[PDB]
Structure 1
Amino acid sequence: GHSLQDPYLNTLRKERVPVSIYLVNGIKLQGQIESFDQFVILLKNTVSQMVYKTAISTVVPSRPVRLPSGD
Structure 2
Amino acid sequence: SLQDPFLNALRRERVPVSIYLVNGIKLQGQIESFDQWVILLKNTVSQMVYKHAISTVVPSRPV
Q: Decide: shared fold, TM above 0.5.
A: yes
TM-score range, shorter chain: over 0.9
Q: Which runs of 5+ in 2 are unaligned?
A: none
SS at structure 2 position matched to 1:63: coil
Q: CA deviation at 1:18?
A: 0.3
> Higher strand proportion, which one?
2
Q: Give the TM-score, by structure 1 length.
A: 0.87
| d(CA) in 2 for partners of 1:46, 1:17 | 16
Q: CA deviation at 1:45?
A: 1.1
Select the structure of larger CA radius of gyration.
Answer: 1
Which residue number corresponds to residue 52 of structure 2? 54
Which residue number corresponds to residue 10 of structure 1? 8
Which one has more relative contact order, counting CA pairs under 8 Å at least 6 apart?
Answer: 1
Percent of aligned pairs sharing the same letter: 92
| d(CA) in 2 for partners of 1:53, 1:41 | 7
Q: Give the TM-score, by structure 2 length.
A: 0.98
Shift >4 Å, 4+ stretches: none
Q: Which runs of 5+ in 1 are unaligned?
A: 66-71
Paired residues in the alignment total 63
Alignment of 1:25 onto 2:58: no
